[PDB]
Amino acid sequence: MVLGLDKRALWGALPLLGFAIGHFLDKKETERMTMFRDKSALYGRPAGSEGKAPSW
Amino acid sequence: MLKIIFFLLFLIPFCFINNMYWMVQIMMFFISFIFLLMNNFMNYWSEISYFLGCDMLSYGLILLSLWICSLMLLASEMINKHNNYKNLFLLNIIILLLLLILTFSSMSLFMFYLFFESSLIPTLFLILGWGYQPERLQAGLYLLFYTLLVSLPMLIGIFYLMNKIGSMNFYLMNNFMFNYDLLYFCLLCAFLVKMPMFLVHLWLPKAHVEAPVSGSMILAGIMLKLGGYGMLRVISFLQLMNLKYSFVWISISLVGGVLVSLVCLRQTDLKALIAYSSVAHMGIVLSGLLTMTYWGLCGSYTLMIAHGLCSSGLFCLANVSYERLGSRSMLINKGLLNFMPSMTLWWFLLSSANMAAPPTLNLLGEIYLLNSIVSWSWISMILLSFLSFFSAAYTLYLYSFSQHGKLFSGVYSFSSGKIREYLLMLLHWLPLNLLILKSESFMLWL
Amino acid sequence: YTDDAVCRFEADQQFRRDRMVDNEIVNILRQRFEDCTLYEAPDHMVKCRPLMDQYEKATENWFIKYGDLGGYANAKTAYMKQKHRLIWERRHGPVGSGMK
Amino acid sequence: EEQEFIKRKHEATLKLRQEFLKQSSNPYRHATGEGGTVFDAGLARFQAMRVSNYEHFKPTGKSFRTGLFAVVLPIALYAWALKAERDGREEKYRTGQVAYKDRQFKFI
Amino acid sequence: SEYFGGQHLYQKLSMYSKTLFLMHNNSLKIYLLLFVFWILILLILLFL
């Protein structure tokens, strides 16, 4: 807002708004993701180490 | 990846708002910077959004697409000078950008093909809405119909694959393998036209010659690469059938390579030289790819990326002459070392990269591809030698005759080099030197 | 199982990582032989064969397991190749003899 | 000397020398500074013929023999040689004649 | 190459485009006669 960024970053916010909306949506994808969350066959902790540690 | 997608959609409005050519430009570079930051992938599909993923193979291709798509706006400013519907230009570019991202991230074959062939339109706008030569009409006919005449038929192969497979995610096809001898040609040849192949090179010189700086940069910078990216994903299950019938394709590519290089020597148009040159390099890429060996494939990925970059920069050079001396001919353009000596530096460098002079991600390619082909068949060496030899040969001629001889008598006063073009040339080349430090991301994807 | 896509995907990733290591063990043995040949100007035959041959065996073993598959190669094609080789060894004898 | 063939060319052909000078020295279109070049028919002729000569191409014996021996026989012969050699080499390979010791390019 | 495809195709298409116009530049009697013939052929083949 130094008159060298007048109306330019202001409109430029909306692309940044896109990133915020894009981020939140994909984070929710990480929600539908959860079927093997710690229940894999390679990283899968058998039982214990939970301790409020939802690895990813 | 939806982060990128939503960013581009929220950039679309700027096309309507007046005087946003430069604001759009900075944003496209800025998001490219953001997409740079997002990098942790392995061979497995990653960043699995609703239907969008990303991978070694797709990650670099997307970065180049975002990279080149931002560099358009640096390249083309005569649109602003003329006020030639800058709004439609900016909208066309962004639409193209979104399609490329969705093409390269479509984890389904059908989604991939859908965006792949959806890109037929916005490119056609870019040539036709801002072309110069009257040939622009027939050129658009060549481009569109060479593509659709084979790009449509793979639609059957895709659905046939569905019926026999049950889906079209890439990992799922890899589990199976098909040998019905038409599936192979229908998919292969359909990609080969856009590759393109020497026997179907025909359209490509025309499309480049009568297209603006922007369209030509797009055409040689992605479209050819996009065809190749599909190949890398699809040949996973075409192996047996490919092995039976592969000598034909490698032969015509290698044979066509020396020929098209000799066409370059005899050619007399800056865009024609580069256009034929780009076909030559994509000939070798098609060869190493169809070798299917590890060395071939991992090198093909690299050479596509490097070739796209060098081809773009050379097109900016061709634009520079076309925008000063107003004529594409070799004859008119000459002795520019006397008029833009600091520019002729960049002429040399971009030429250097195209003849595989290090440190150059292009060069890194040919080591990989040439190793693959030589292993595949010792007979190749007798033509590989000449192919590279004439590759460098015409590039030498292009650099020298354009920049060296005594000036042309009839030449009307034209402005000198300028920051936009200077920065444009650095931006295409300097990353082409950067990447060698960390080729592993651009070198390993299998 | 025949169609256990998640399991097959898990197997391939194990195969890839194992490939990357065994891929490597060839390199390290090469680097090891490299040092010896640099050891002393007269000292080449002093320990070339005693040290190189480890690298020689490593290459051939590495080829047999992973070699000849090309890119895209997953656990399935590698695993069944071993099956094919076992069948060949049992039927036609040592590879490197033609057939009977 | 043909009786003035050189002369007959001389008269007209020396006129446009001056017009070239007038064009080149033209202070006005050089002042416009838009770039560009004095028009030159030979250049314009040359570009047009260079881009278009198919409408002249008659598919006769000459062109056919020319093209046939230009790429076709090259393409066919080279491809046939490649396939033939590979067929032999692969035949040895699938026969198992050469074990996992002698063979080359173990690493592609 | 382009003669084998390219412009030559558009040349042959124009030839055939002209032809179809000559078909369609006629009197309606001719076309109905076609249809009558098609009927007549099917009718006798029912008998045969």
Place this chain on the structure above:
Amino acid sequence: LTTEDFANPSPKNWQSYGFDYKDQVEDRKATKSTFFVTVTLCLVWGSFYWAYLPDTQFRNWAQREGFLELRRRELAGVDLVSPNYVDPASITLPSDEDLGDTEIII
């Protein structure tokens, strides 16, 4: 124009940087903004971020084991590079009748 005009040119004219040929400040702010976004933002910070990127492809980790695995097999006395995907005993070859000349491959 005359001697002093050339000698000390006025601050009216302005040499376009190739981006905007209408306003001085619009051209200069465009070039200023364009240069920053392109060079520093990507070709310094981004290069820095890659150069210090963590193990993504697990190459370094692969050559973690490379030292260990080799060392593990060398005191273990088992083959350093085992040529079998799994144990040749674990595999169960089917009988020759099942083979029935199914084009066995070397």
Place this chain on the structure above:
Amino acid sequence: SAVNDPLELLTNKGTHEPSFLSPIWNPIACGVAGVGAAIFINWGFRKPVFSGIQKHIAFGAIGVGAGAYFDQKRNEYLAKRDAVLRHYIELHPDDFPVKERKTYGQVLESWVPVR
């Protein structure tokens, strides 16, 4: 299981969690269409796209309803399709005997040597 059971493979055992986007997508597609159409209307008529927002609100309202109305029809439609297919499997178990899952260790495929 190790048993390729057609019915149980088809049965709605669940494990289908809708996204925050899964139901909302149609409403914010039809309404977005109708809003864009009104902008399209004014754009061709040489009228301000902003102007006459009553057209835009109405277009949004109708579209939103249709998407919700048609989302409903689909979900019924899909439910019925599953019902028939499960019915036909139960009708003709003889035609679709349950098949057994095997493992690659029990099969011999043919590979492709690049060599």
Place this chain on the structure above:
Amino acid sequence: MFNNSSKILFITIMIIGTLITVTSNSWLGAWMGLEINLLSFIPLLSDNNNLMSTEASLKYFLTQVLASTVLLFSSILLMLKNNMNNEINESFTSMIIMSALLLKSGAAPFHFWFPNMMEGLTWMNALMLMTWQKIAPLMLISYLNIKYLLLISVILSVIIGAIGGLNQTSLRKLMAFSSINHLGWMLSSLMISESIWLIYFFFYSFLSFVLTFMFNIFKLFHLNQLFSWFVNSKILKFTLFMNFLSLGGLPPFLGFLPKWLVIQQLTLCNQYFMLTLMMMSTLITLFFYLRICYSAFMMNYFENNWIMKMNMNSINYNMYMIMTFFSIFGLFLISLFYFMF
């Protein structure tokens, strides 16, 4: 509803007549409905204001009347020698019934009347013949089940349907040839299945409906008129003309959605060869559509001088370019359509 009030009446009677056919239980009832269609449509087609309308009327009547004559006749034979409407099998009794229906709807070998028609017809009259006068004969073709005749029709339904379109300069004849090609797709689609055929016709109806409905609006009757038609910006000249590419159904134009549906189900039937041929010709269809779109893709052409302003109806224009906007962004409604499963 073009000029008079009687337009509403004859349209209504036409609808009832054709609706009888599609709901007809026996061949005779279907024939009855068809003739009622023949009545109701002739007056609309035969405007008394001009000449060309009247000549189209004799040709339409003189053709359809024979079609109905043969249709009923062949019905009696089939429903004699089989003594039942649903014959056990398709024999020579039945091919004649298709040949009747194919002529009535203007299919491949029986089409010549159909281009000559277009000269006479005005736009919406043409439109109405394009869309609605092809439902009943096609829905009957559904009941008839002779593979090979439909196949020869489909083979020839694009060859002429595109080669002629290359040649025509009168928009009236181009629409004829454009539809004959599209009619090729319906016929194949109906040989495969009916639900997909229903969908494809509807999208064709929609698309042809919007297309000719603007040509009516601006009264553009010749390629020259298209190049000459004034638009203030020569940008909506281009935005509106995307639909000419929606004709070819290239993905981002919503014409792809039906063509994709037909292709998917057709190849599921495994008639791959047939797809190749129709789809080869599709390019020729799209070819002359680009030949049309030279008017708008590039901008700022050479124009006539006298025109200063361009005007059109509120109602027609307001309806028209809503349909266009859908032709632009139609695909993302992928979810909204649930009739494909």
